[PDB]
Amino acid sequence: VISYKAGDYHLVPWFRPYDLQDGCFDRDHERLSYRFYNLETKVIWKAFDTPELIGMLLHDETVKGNSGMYAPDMLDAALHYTREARYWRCIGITKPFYDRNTLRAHCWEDNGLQVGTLVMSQAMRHALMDLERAVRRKELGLEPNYLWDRWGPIGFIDGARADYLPRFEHNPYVDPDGVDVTEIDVLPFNTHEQIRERYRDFIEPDTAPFEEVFRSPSHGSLTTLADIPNASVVALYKDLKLKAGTPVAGDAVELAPADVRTLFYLSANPEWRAVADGKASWEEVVDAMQPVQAELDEKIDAARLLQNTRHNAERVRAFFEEKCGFHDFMYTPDKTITAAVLCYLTELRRICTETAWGAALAKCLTDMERVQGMGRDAFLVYRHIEDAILDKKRRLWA
Amino acid sequence: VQVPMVEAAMFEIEKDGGFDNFILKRSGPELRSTYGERIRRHLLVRQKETQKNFVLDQQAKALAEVTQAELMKATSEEELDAVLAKYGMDAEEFKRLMAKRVMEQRKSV
Amino acid sequence: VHANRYVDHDTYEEKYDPHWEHNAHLVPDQQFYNIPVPKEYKDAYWWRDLQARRVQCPTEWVHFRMHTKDKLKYDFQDLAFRKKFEYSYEDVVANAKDMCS
Amino acid sequence: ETTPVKYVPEMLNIQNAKWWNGRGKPVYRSTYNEKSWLEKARWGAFTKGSRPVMRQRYSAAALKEALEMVPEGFETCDVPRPPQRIRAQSEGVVGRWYTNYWTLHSVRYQCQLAGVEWQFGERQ
Amino acid sequence: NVAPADYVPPSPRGIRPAAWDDEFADVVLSMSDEEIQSYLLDKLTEVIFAETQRDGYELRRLDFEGKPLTELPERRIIENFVFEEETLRERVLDRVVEGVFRLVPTSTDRLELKSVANIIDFVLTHVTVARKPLQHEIPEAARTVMRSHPLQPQLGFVHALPTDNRDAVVQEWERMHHLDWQFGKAVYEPRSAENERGNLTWLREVRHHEAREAFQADVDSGEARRRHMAKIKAAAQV
Amino acid sequence: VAPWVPPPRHDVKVTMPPPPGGEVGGSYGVSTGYSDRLARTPYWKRMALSTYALRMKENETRYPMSPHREGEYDLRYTVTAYPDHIKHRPLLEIGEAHQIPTIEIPVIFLVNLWDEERLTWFGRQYETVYVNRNVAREELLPQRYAIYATEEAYKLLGLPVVNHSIHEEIPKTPHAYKKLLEKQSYTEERWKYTIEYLFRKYEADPPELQDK
RNA sequence: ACAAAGAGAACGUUUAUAUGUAAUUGUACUAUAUUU
User: Fold this and answer.
1) Could you tell me the CA-to-CA distances from B75 to B64, B78, B80 in Å, in that order?
2) Alpha-carbon distances of A28 from A23, A39, C77, E172, E223, rounded to whole Å
3) Whole-number Å distance, CA F172 to C1' G6?
4) Which of A49, A60, A362, D123 is buried deepest, with most CB atoms within 10 A?
């Protein structure tokens, strides 16, 4: 039985799942396509434009699950191109590829019947003016003003707009010296190893002056007050300062030396070192009594390299500002940023296979899986370091 | 389903049994509409399914009898899984239903 | 061609239905000769049937076969302006002498 | 659109003949009107009034052998005269020629002249 | 906004995350696709209100006594909460999405991962791609009870649907509007069981099946063989 | 162009040509039928594949009627090949008003529907009742509480198939309706008319002159 | 055009009805009346 009052029922009333492609490859060759034709160029697509972020996509593509990214057979390539993807980036080339396969800087002069010399665009032979003009001034005795050293991220650093290489035929580049250059000048310089030779230094990124600042614990927004025990250590350091040679009571707020600010943290969060220094008050002992905490500083620093260079350029910019010592990133010289990235990748090819822990330190993704894999005790402090780097910006955020 | 029809096609439905026959009885040139294809190709596939869900049950009541005898051996309720495992039925939802059987029946008491 | 096809259980494929090709209403087509459809879904293709019978010309070009007294000697179902069978002139001779009329 | 098109311009008998102004038939007219309007106007060539529908004339023994096809019990009253609009036809003597009214009452007449006896009824 | 031409389907296919491990205790996330979010809805609730109101915000609904009137701030805002602040996003990302799930995001992800109203979708994905796929096995002893029945389904009809695929920008308007059963348009969702009451194509099949029984029975008794020979007996008489 | 011009509609016969279209489902417009296969087949062949008993069974005549369209005149023998026009007229005549009154249609009831307001069954299970049209269109049919009482659902529902004149003709007039009502009152109450209902008139007409 | 009838009036339509000048029109008993 059913009851219906009636006049009722009134009949009418994009995230991709990141799956490893090892399970997708049905064969061997089509894997090599995904490795080269899909990922290698993606490194070269960054090695040409801006290798400052070549280490960020690595974490991203590792989320999608490729196997041999951090392994050298990318870095053996990336470190190679990230040098000469400048050599031709300063000849003038804009798109690195002439097709899918070949390089824009390897389409030879003759269509295909040439061996070593390359067809240039009016951008090239007009970007090779500033090169050859830099040469004359390098032999003139006057300042070899390389206009393409004033270039940078957002162009010329000097608040000046940048002209374009196919310069209008009525605005020839004003030369305060007078060394005129034209198409007859850059005519004979066409073959690669007959142009790599003339002005090598002016294009070669200077990695030697920034060989390494990465195997040394540094910090971005930390001071002498910067600590989680905002009463135990920061006052202990007063007891470390009144007890030091040439003592001053902890009456100032000037950050301690960079290399020692991390030593606070080995004793700040680890409540063993927070009492192993909680009884000792000398200044000589707090830096010496921890060999172990300094014999494993590599495992402490590397995790501050990878994790702060993965997530966002806003970190990698900051990280390139923390280590290489920048004021801002946007107002910077082009070649030195090529240096700053070089050293970031000079070590990434040794940090992997040398440091057994470093191998899975980078292949890993989550913060926990590294601790469970790599040195945990070096991470309990390193996690605290990371807990502190934002605790000073947090007040600046308020 | 709201198709537009004439004053007369509102009466062709009742004498024909509903909206299903009135579409399938006429044929193409008889049912001049083009909505009489968007909807006829729907009834046909919806009827072709209705006769699949049906055999899906006569294929299921057939599987019940080859279990109802195999279910009679109540020697141990732990080999009752092997009774269903021979037929691939999952023990969980079965005893669960049989645990509804202790309430779904005793709700009418 | 994949409608109402019994699928065999173990193989997971359309086992051969010899009865299928006889409930088939072969639908004409311009890129394919004829596409066999099960009768039950034939009524969606009643136009492309009446468009295939229709003489592919416009009528106004084959109008001359419709107005004169060749109206009677020409098929005209679905405007198919095609000729009916016509006896030869030599056959009609023999086919009327063998009646000795 | 309340009404699609009211007052269609064909209601004026616009002479759109293909030999006159170049336009063919309006689309509403069918492109093949099989028989012209004259053939539907003359019923005389369409309805049997004083008109010999059945062409064939059978012999004496040819009519003593079409009667051998009439089934037992058939009365010539049940077969009614077809209506007007149905063209008066006679296909000759074929399967169940009796049910064809025109053939029936014409084969019947050929039996009146040929002496054969119309055994079945009248037109009661 | 309906389709970006590569709109990934939910894809319940079972490929487990690298640090998912034993499904992170598996059974803890072998929960129904909302029970998965059930822990989220209390986690993400905790990710505010003594997670950021403990340090750097003011959202507890003031009252006449200068106090949180409501138990928690209006949970509607918690659902649609835009963590536009970078670290304050991270500070609420190192808790729920990366605290428990180990769902390491990409720079692309965290770039799209703006508000937790969207980030719930992200966490729903990996578990769903970690949702182990069903093992479609049939014990052959059960098949012979299927592979022997006289009644088998036709199983070709979906192809006889009126094809609709075109520019699908207007395939969503039909939802908010009442238009998907208009002008003969009809959505088709395949089912398993029908309403036995009033379905004139169900009952019509019963009185066809229930006739196939009375016939099949009359083969067992041996009479269809008798009347099939009663005709021949009346067929060879002369 | 047309690869494979389709064949005629119903060329099942072997001697006589197929019937015109429409009759068998096609396009009206010809009063003949022409099977090119039949004509091109010669005579000695066309007579070979048949026997006299069969020849008199496809020369068969239905002259006043159509052998394919039931109840329809032979549109081979009509004035024009198109289907009939008077036995197919629409609802409203050329100048008549849309005075089609309130019609009530029968529906078998699949549910003991109990009206809350009157405590009255709309009907028990398997009970055909003449209800208003929209109720049966928007209330009783969507909730699977009833089905249209066509004479083929009386068979599906194990019921006895009774005639209802269900919209056979649609009565355009309240007189045309109130007469159609007097027809079902003859189908459903045949015994009410076969003879007297009950001749109260002719059985002891003044019997209570006596005994108080 | 609007209202009215007709359909348990989500609307589409077909009849019966006087509105605006809408807007065009035009308006000097054998008798002995009448055609304005």
Assistant:
1) 20, 9, 9
2) 12, 16, 63, 42, 67
3) 10
4) A362
